[PDB]
Design a protein around this ligand. Structure first.
Ligand SMILES: CN(C)CCCN1c2ccccc2Sc2ccc(Cl)cc21
Ligand SMILES: [Ca+2]
Ligand SMILES: [Ca+2]
Ligand SMILES: [Ca+2]
Ligand SMILES: [Ca+2]
Lengths: 89, 89
């Protein structure tokens, strides 16, 4: 697989690794998002150390008002991050 | 860097290796998009070698009508591919 293909599979791989941990296996609840951020985005984003910060990130990424982050909501997030990274270049 | 961080930077690195070959260094003209797809998406997509197929794909991805694919347009393309792959699993 090419560099691009590996990255696409990796976005899926990571989402599922965290979403699959508790309850709905296709959505990130607040605990799993916190773990994803803390363990997969430790160079790009501040560590979240407080629940009320977690709560605040979730309500942003959660567009459909269900309290959790689904794959399309996670892709929105990844696009936000990649755009900030691209701009930084 | 984590699986996720590597994947973000790969999206950038791939776009810019193809975008910087001709003309605008931050956009993909048709020839650059052609080779990116042909060389970086070969397990996901069929190769494209007829100019009216290239035209049609560019027409699909070009949202601002300048005849090129910029980075936000490439990320839209990536999220598409990523969504289709997630669907399969
Ligand atoms: C382009 N450069 C000079 C920054 C390098 C990339 N880089 C980075 C980039 C943008 C935002 C945050 C970071 S954290 C980081 C931590 C370790 C390493 Cl090894 C690299 C990075
Ligand atoms: Ca879950
Ligand atoms: Ca949601
Ligand atoms: Ca170019
Ligand atoms: Ca365009």
């Amino acid at each position: 697989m090419s560099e691009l293909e590996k990255a696409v599979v990796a976005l899926i791989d990571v989402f599922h690794q965290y979403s699959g941990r508790e309850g709905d296996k296709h959505k990130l609840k607040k605990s799993e998002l916190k773990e994803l951020i803390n363990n997969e985005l430790s160079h790009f984003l501040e560590e979240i150390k407080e629940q009320e910060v977690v709560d605040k990130v979730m309500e942003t990424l959660d567009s459909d008002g269900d309290g959790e982050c689904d794959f399309q909501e996670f892709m929105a997030f990844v696009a936000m991050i990649t755009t900030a990274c691209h701009e930084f270049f």
